[PDB]
Design an enzyme around this catalytic site. Structure first.
Site, PDB file in Angstrom:
ATOM      1  N   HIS B  40      17.094  -0.634  30.609  1.00  0.00           N
ATOM      2  CA  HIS B  40      17.177   0.810  30.393  1.00  0.00           C
ATOM      3  C   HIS B  40      15.919   1.547  30.884  1.00  0.00           C
ATOM      4  O   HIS B  40      15.860   2.769  30.829  1.00  0.00           O
ATOM      5  CB  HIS B  40      17.459   1.135  28.918  1.00  0.00           C
ATOM      6  CG  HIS B  40      16.300   0.907  27.999  1.00  0.00           C
ATOM      7  ND1 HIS B  40      16.170  -0.232  27.233  1.00  0.00           N
ATOM      8  CD2 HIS B  40      15.298   1.731  27.607  1.00  0.00           C
ATOM      9  CE1 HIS B  40      15.146  -0.099  26.409  1.00  0.00           C
ATOM     10  NE2 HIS B  40      14.603   1.085  26.614  1.00  0.00           N
ATOM     11  N   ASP B  84      20.216  -6.090  28.138  1.00  0.00           N
ATOM     12  CA  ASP B  84      19.190  -5.094  28.447  1.00  0.00           C
ATOM     13  C   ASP B  84      17.943  -5.797  28.979  1.00  0.00           C
ATOM     14  O   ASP B  84      16.908  -5.878  28.302  1.00  0.00           O
ATOM     15  CB  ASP B  84      18.861  -4.271  27.192  1.00  0.00           C
ATOM     16  CG  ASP B  84      17.975  -3.058  27.478  1.00  0.00           C
ATOM     17  OD1 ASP B  84      17.838  -2.659  28.654  1.00  0.00           O
ATOM     18  OD2 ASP B  84      17.438  -2.483  26.510  1.00  0.00           O
ATOM     19  N   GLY B 175       8.498   4.295  23.573  1.00  0.00           N
ATOM     20  CA  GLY B 175       7.401   3.979  24.469  1.00  0.00           C
ATOM     21  C   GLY B 175       7.036   2.508  24.488  1.00  0.00           C
ATOM     22  O   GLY B 175       6.220   2.103  25.302  1.00  0.00           O
ATOM     23  N   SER B 177       9.511   0.171  24.622  1.00  0.00           N
ATOM     24  CA  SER B 177      10.627  -0.456  25.345  1.00  0.00           C
ATOM     25  C   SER B 177      10.147  -1.306  26.512  1.00  0.00           C
ATOM     26  O   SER B 177       9.311  -0.854  27.289  1.00  0.00           O
ATOM     27  CB  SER B 177      11.553   0.612  25.917  1.00  0.00           C
ATOM     28  OG  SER B 177      12.643   0.842  25.057  1.00  0.00           O
ATOM     29  N   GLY B 178      10.826  -2.427  26.738  1.00  0.00           N
ATOM     30  CA  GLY B 178      10.486  -3.295  27.863  1.00  0.00           C
ATOM     31  C   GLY B 178       9.373  -4.292  27.571  1.00  0.00           C
ATOM     32  O   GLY B 178       9.253  -5.298  28.260  1.00  0.00           O
TER      33      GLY B 178
END
Ligand SMILES: [Ca+2]
Lengths: 171, 223
Positions: B40, B84, B175, B177-178
């Site tokens: 995402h 994801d 913030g 994420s990932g």
């Protein structure tokens, strides 16, 4: 990529924004009672050009910093003033199905509320967007349905739509 | 990261910041040329910043390298939040050193209860927002799948794990994420989604990396 406000900055995931008309004809998005509602439960576009509407909190479940086009969203109004009989009304936007004027955007508690996510998609040089609803791909544009008795501009899922909006930061 | 602490400088050397104007997602360095992040976080232009501690100040340890290949999982489903995971190939290899190092892919999945380290430059508040200059760290356990499935009824797939606390108070956030969830020196999760941050009964949900090791190895080898 990122949805941008009218100052050209990416929307903050979880930030509060006025949702303004792309044209100078209308004001922003707010809530009004409609039909036999005794609390302001219908999500409407204000007809008063000076009216910014209610600040709306725009968020994605994804823990990304900014709102991106195509990401699933939740929308909810920031606190606004209601009569004492209406205090504590839930302010999350819902799409309530099989209403007369088609599936309509409502706040408050809705048993008929469809499962799904909103998303934003760019249309416009200027930073203009449309809202779509995707029931839980197959997604419908949010447009306007004019109340016949009222003149009220109700937000509904509308094939021959869509409502075009831009965002302005509360901050 | 809500309820964490400031990591010791460059003590999480596999952590990367994805930057497109500013920091918007994290990621993990898995070899000198490849970064793993969340699907995402996909964006057409991404600069990967390695060796960071204070993302607002040039400290002298940084390597800024543009993403060359950006490959989201072929089964990523934006609105079911499933699969994801994304790989980024750097347009030139990172120089590996004490401040810039790789994290190992999992040899097996993590047992419920395993304690992990989550890190990122995301929001530190469960209400309002405050984005830190300095990298934040948090220790949190892998929750049981039954716990996880019960937190988000109908939403948890086999490609998702919950990591955190049912009591709330400590969680990753916007913030983050990932970014990495590393348990026993192995990358087991990628920060993905949740309802709010650090809310009771609403733990963080993370991509289950141990499901993807073959896809990862396969993609790197072919690309
Ligand atoms: Ca720095």
């Amino acid at each position: 990529d990122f949805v941008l406000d009218n100052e050209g900055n990416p929307l903050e995931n979880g930030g509060t924004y006025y949702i303004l008309s792309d044209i100078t004809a209308f004001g922003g998005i707010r809530a009004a009672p409609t039909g036999n509602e005794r609390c302001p439960l219908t999500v409407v576009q204000s007809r008063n050009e000076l009216d910014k509407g209610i600040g709306t909190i725009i968020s994605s479940p994804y823990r990304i910093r900014f709102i991106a086009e195509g990401h699933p969203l939740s929308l909810k109004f920031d606190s606004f003033a209601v009569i004492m009989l209406c205090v504590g009304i839930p302010t999350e936007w819902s799409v309530v199905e099989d209403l007369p004027e088609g599936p309509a955007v409502k706040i408050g508690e809705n048993k008929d509320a469809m499962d799904g996510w909103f998303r934003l998609e760019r249309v416009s040089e200027f930073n203009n967007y449309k809202l779509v609803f995707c029931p839980q791909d197959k997604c419908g544009d949010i447009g306007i349905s004019i109340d016949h008795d009222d003149g009220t501009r109700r937000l509904v899922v509308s094939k021959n739509k869509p409502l075009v909006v831009q965002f302005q930061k509360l901050d | 990261i809500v309820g964490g602490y400031t990591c010791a400088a460059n003590s999480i050397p596999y952590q990367v910041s994805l930057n497109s104007g500013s920091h918007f997602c994290g990621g993990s360095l898995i070899n000198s040329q490849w970064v793993v992040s969340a699907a995402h976080c996909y964006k057409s232009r991404i600069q990967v910043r390695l060796g960071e501690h204070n993302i607002d100040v040039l400290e002298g340890n940084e390597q800024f390298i543009n993403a060359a290949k950006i490959i989201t999982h072929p089964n990523f489903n934006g609105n079911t939040l499933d699969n994801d995971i994304m790989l980024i190939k750097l347009s030139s290899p990172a120089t590996l050193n004490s401040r810039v190092a790789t994290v190992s892919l999992p040899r097996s999945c993590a047992a419920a209860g395993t304690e992990c380290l989550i890190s990122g430059w995301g929001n530190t508040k469960s209400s309002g927002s405050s984005y830190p200059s300095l990298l934040q760290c948090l220790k949190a356990p892998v929750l049981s799948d039954s716990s996880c499935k019960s937190s988000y009824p109908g939403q948890i797939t086999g490609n998702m794990i919950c990591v955190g606390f049912l009591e709330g108070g400590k969680d990753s956030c916007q913030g983050d994420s990932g970014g990495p969830v590393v348990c026993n020196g192995q990358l087991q999760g990628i920060v993905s989604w949740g309802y709010g941050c650090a809310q009771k009964n609403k733990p963080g949900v993370y991509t289950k990396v141990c499901n993807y090791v073959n896809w990862i190895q396969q993609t790197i080898a072919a690309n």
